[PDB]
Structure formats: structure tokens, C-alpha cells
């Protein structure tokens, strides 16, 4: 991808595939509704 | 990077977390809170006063 992907997975397989694929890089699952989105976003932007 | 600091009689208390090794490990990084901003502490750092 060039632009960041937007995944549409009604079955939930793609999210677990992404979890497994980037697990070695310490991938974090968050949500837009969660109030911790700001801190997680800033931490990701500063530390990969 | 190794660091040598002179005039230690004018010691800056900003070094207190660094000398105390008050590190916070999260996400594989080693976070040191130098004042108000977080810095990823590289393991090769050393300071001599």
C-alpha cells in the first residue's frame, strides 16, 4: 500500500491475520471510541 | 553516546532520573523521562562526571 489500508472484515479473519503478521513488531489493537487513542497514537508516531 | 560532564559542583538535578536509572520499559523500548519529554534510552549510553 501507499495510503494506509482500511480493512473491511465482517468475518474477523483479517484482523487476526494482521495481529499475527505484525506481532513480532509489537502491534497494538485500539479503537476510535476508546479514550486511550490519543496516547497510543502519539506513542506509535514517536516509537514505531 | 558516552558523555563526560565537567563542573559537577554545578550539578543539574535534571540528571536525577538518569543517575537513578528510573527507566520504564514498554513496547520493547526503554523510556527515560528527562524532565517533561520521554526519550528512548539507548543501552550504550554512559555518563562520567
From Swiss-Prot, chain B:
Complex and partners: Homodimer. The cytoplasmic dynein 1 complex consists of two catalytic heavy chains (HCs) and a number of non-catalytic subunits presented by intermediate chains (ICs), light intermediate chains (LICs) and light chains (LCs); the composition seems to vary in respect to the IC, LIC and LC composition. The heavy chain homodimer serves as a scaffold for the probable homodimeric assembly of the respective non-catalytic subunits. The ICs and LICs bind directly to the HC dimer and dynein LCs assemble on the IC dimer. Interacts with DYNC1LI1; DYNC1LI1 and DYNC1LI2 bind mutually exclusive to DYNC1H1.
What family is this?
A: Belongs to the dynein heavy chain family.
As recorded in Swiss-Prot or TrEMBL, the protein's gene is named DYNC1H1
Medical condition linked: Charcot-Marie-Tooth disease, axonal, type 2O: An axonal form of Charcot-Marie-Tooth disease, a disorder of the peripheral nervous system, characterized by progressive weakness and atrophy, initially of the peroneal muscles and later of the distal muscles of the arms. Charcot-Marie-Tooth disease is classified in two main groups on the basis of electrophysiologic properties and histopathology: primary peripheral demyelinating neuropathies (designated CMT1 when they are dominantly inherited) and primary peripheral axonal neuropathies (CMT2). Cortical dysplasia, complex, with other brain malformations 13: An autosomal dominant disorder characterized by global developmental delay with impaired intellectual development. Some patients show signs of peripheral neuropathy, such as abnormal gait and hyporeflexia. CDCBM13 is associated with variable neuronal migration defects resulting in cortical malformations.
Q: Tell me the compartments it is located in.
A: Cytoplasm, Cytoskeleton
Q: What does this protein do?
A: Cytoplasmic dynein 1 acts as a motor for the intracellular retrograde motility of vesicles and organelles along microtubules. Dynein has ATPase activity; the force-producing power stroke is thought to occur on release of ADP. Plays a role in mitotic spindle assembly and metaphase plate congression.
Disulfide topology = none
What the entry says about domains is: Dynein heavy chains probably consist of an N-terminal stem (which binds cargo and interacts with other dynein components), and the head or motor domain. The motor contains six tandemly-linked AAA domains in the head, which form a ring. A stalk-like structure (formed by two of the coiled coil domains) protrudes between AAA 4 and AAA 5 and terminates in a microtubule-binding site. A seventh domain may also contribute to this ring; it is not clear whether the N-terminus or the C-terminus forms this extra domain.
Q: Which domain of life is it from?
A: Eukaryota
**Part of the whole protein covered:** 3631 to 3679 of 4646
Write down what this protein is called: Cytoplasmic dynein 1 heavy chain 1
